[PDB]
Amino acid sequence: REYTAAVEAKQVAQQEAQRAQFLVEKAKQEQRQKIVQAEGEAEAAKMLGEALSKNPGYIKLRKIRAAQNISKTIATSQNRIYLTADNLVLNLQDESFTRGSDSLIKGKK
Amino acid sequence: REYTAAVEAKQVAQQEAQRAQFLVEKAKQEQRQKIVQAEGEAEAAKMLGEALSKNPGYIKLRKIRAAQNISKTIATSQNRIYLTADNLVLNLQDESFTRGSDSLIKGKK
Amino acid sequence: REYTAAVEAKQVAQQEAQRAQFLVEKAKQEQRQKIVQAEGEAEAAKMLGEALSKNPGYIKLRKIRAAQNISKTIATSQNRIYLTADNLVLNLQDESFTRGSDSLIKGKK
Amino acid sequence: VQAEGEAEAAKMLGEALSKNPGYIKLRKIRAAQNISKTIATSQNRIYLTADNLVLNLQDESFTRGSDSLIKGKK
Amino acid sequence: KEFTEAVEAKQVAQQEAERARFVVEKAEQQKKAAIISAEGDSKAAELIANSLATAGDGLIELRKLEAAEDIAYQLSRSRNITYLPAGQSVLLQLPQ
Amino acid sequence: KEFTEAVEAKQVAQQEAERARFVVEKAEQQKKAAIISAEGDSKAAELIANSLATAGDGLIELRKLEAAEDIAYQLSRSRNITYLPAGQSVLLQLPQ
Amino acid sequence: KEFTEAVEAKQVAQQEAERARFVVEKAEQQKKAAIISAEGDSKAAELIANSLATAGDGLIELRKLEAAEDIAYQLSRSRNITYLPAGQSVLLQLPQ
Amino acid sequence: QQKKAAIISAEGDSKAAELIANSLATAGDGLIELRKLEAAEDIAYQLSRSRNITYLPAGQSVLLQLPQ
Questions:
Q1: What angle do CA D47, D51, D54 make, to 5 degrees?
Q2: F48 in helix, strand or coil?
């Protein structure tokens, strides 16, 4: 079973070493394609880095809008979870109520 | 199957690269459409900063009103979020009653 | 049972020990085969080490993007998990909010 | 006479096995041969500690659970 | 079975390698498209960033408050969502 | 029975040994090709690492925010997953 | 019953002594064979350590992470897996 | 007779230890792991026939509400 199988495997492995350098080429083309897919991801990466790493203005607002896209997606989310209480600062009558978001005075944030 | 598919896909790929420049135009248009969704968001942003970076007043008041609205739709929310003891002070008799209600003092807010 | 079994074992073992030095050879070729499969892996590894060891830019973004890939997979996941909720940092009214994504300023990440 | 004999077996088995109950570990095994002969009629529900059976196989509790013996941890 | 399959794979792979040179071209074009769409999103975002940086954190927090209404709106289409205060020593113990 | 089995194994071992020498050569070609698919991925990764090192952590955090939406999208196609604070004395429990 | 059995064990144990002689001649060879298959694994590994030392933790990390796609592909056939943050007072519990 | 023979059966398995023990004490759990994986195949055929196998956390003040 494995004797003729291995001999034919050696011959087809000559053929497939030729076709495996050919795979170098073809999967190189699919490599550029997948590079380019994850590099549209990466151009999102660049764009957002240059835009919002100097100072996260919309990365602040995207902590926000993407915690809310996460929690516009928490519908699927059976997930038990825990945010923090001083996050939603449901501390309405508190000293640290607007320690949470008088951090709007930049420096606390 | 993948041979005829590949060749037809190469010809369709030439015509679809032309249509892909057309797609670049169409996606600049979608660029504008989502630019503007979050730029109505951003009109809110620019003005809310100019009116609150002075001192977060509607942001104080909108932590309060977003806590109120968060409660308000916690009503329909099954969420086993909570609050806890002693800020909305319903230790209705307490110093903390004058440290959650007198927490409204500026400096403590 | 064990007498004839042992005698046939010894004879079959003479020819099988010839066959098993021959297995040193055979398993050596399988050795190099497994070597080169996990070397596709390994030189992907060398290349990624030049990609990332210099600076964990995509090590950071891939902690996170593998988070999201692992997550697209955690669809099937039952695995009961945690965050540190200051990881997405959904801290939707908080100072620690803009400590999570003022880590955008390189150095805290 | 009886108590001296039995509790003196206890005496000196005790010194020998309290420099280490290592023979008592090999005796877990050998008295377990006898116990596989006999205790077959049993229902024991005996939970014990993690680091015997293999696959705690590279964290602290088992690096001192089986891998302990590396000179430096014993 | 691997001989004819290997020959057809080589032929299909040459067709796909030329088609995939043109698909790397297509991928540059489709990335113009995807960059510009994800940047519909993200250029809306950068103009929001400019608004919040020049004006301050106004709607940083106020879409952290308006969209914080989304928390109470949307948390418990499931049944186990909640939170836990910080600056403290919480004994977190997730529900069952 | 082990006699015939082991002799057959000897002949199979000869053929597999020569086979596998050339499988190692074909695998030099295929290691290049697999490095190349992993290059699709990993070279997207080189350009991402360069992009983020040059431009800070924008999408380090914004695939932690934008594609963190994936976390809510996916975490819960089962019913016992969660995400939960720290920076406290959190004394985590996990459920039945 | 143990008289004939004892004599048989006597003779068969001498035969097994000689069979042991050549079973670990065979097992000189079989130690080598198993050594060498595990060496295929472990020399993929020698050069993997080489690749990730001459280059670094790139894919020491990313075949955690690209392979964490596999973490999630493989874990979930089970239904009680977890991963829970450090920097806390976790009293980690387990499900039922 | 087993003075000789047991001391010897040890000599064998024991110094199988001696050698792997140098392997580990020198550098660590390298074939412990790799034959965790040869194990995976065969041995964890056997140990996936076995039902429940959890893991444990690390780096925390860990505890456990063990199965009832």
A1: 110
A2: helix
Distance between CA F86 and CA C20 in Å, rounded?
A: 58
Give the three-state DSSP class for B77.
Answer: coil
Residues of G in contact with C10 (CB under 8 A): 18-19, 22-23
- The CA distance from D65 to D49, in Å, is 9
Residues of G in contact with F41 (CB under 8 A): 66
For residues H12 and D69, what is the distance between their CA atoms, to the nearest angstrom?
19
Alpha carbons F34 and G65: distance in angstroms, whole number: 17
Write b or e for each residue in A4-18: b if 16 or more Cβ atoms lie within 10 A of its Cβ, otherwise e.
eebeebbebbebbbe
Which residues make beta-bridge pairs with E83?
A83
What span, in angstroms and rounded, lies between the C-alpha atoms of C108 and C105?
7
How crowded is residue G5: how many other Cβ atoms within 10 Å of its Cβ? Answer: 9
Any idea what DSSP says for residue G82? -
Indicate yes or no: CB of E48 within 8 angstroms of CB of B41: yes
Closest CA to G41 of H28, H41, C50: H41
Contact B60, B54 (CB under 8 A): no
Alpha carbon distance B22, A54 (integer Å): 34
Obtained via which technique? cryo-EM
Q: How many residues does chain G have?
A: 96
Resolution for the entry shown, Å: 22.0
Hey, what's the torsion of the CAs at F66, F67, F73, F77, to 10 degrees? -160
Distance to chain B for E84, nearest Cα, Å: 9
Question: Among candidates B50, H8, A42, D65, which has minimal Cα distance to E38?
Answer: A42
DSSP lists the bridge partners of residue A81 as F83
